[PDB]
Amino acid sequence: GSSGSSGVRAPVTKVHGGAGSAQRMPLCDKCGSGIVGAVVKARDKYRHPECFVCADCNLNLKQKGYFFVEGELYCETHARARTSGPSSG
Ligand SMILES: [Zn+2]
Numbered sequence: 001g002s003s004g005s006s007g008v009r010a011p012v013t014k015v016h017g018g019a020g021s022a023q024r025m026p027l028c029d030k031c032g033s034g035i036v037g038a039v040v041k042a043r044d045k046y047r048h049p050e051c052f053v054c055a056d057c058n059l060n061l062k063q064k065g066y067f068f069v070e071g072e073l074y075c076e077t078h079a080r081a082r083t084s085g086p087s088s089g
């Protein structure tokens with residue numbers, strides 16, 4: 001018998017900011033290619049109208065319900081598996 005106890009908690013933080021020069025346009029995090037004309041931004045990130053897809057099946061989430069798991073995107077199917085049973089927020 002061990003009858004021991006443990007406990008650990010490591011929070012996380014994010015930061016975004018950049019100064020210099022640019023064409024005032026979002027950079028597709030998918031093909032890293034300047035976006036001009038038509039873009040698709042879910043929450044804070046931006047993705048082309050064609051690049052927007054799952055990371056496992058590459059399914060166009062544009063029309064479908066996009067998801068955010070660990071920064072990466074996913075379809076209702078895959079995503080659901082990842083965020084399966086989310087916490088009360
Ligand atoms: Zn793109």
Ligand SMILES: [Zn+2]
Binds near residue numbers: 055056057058075078
């Ligand atoms: Zn998928």
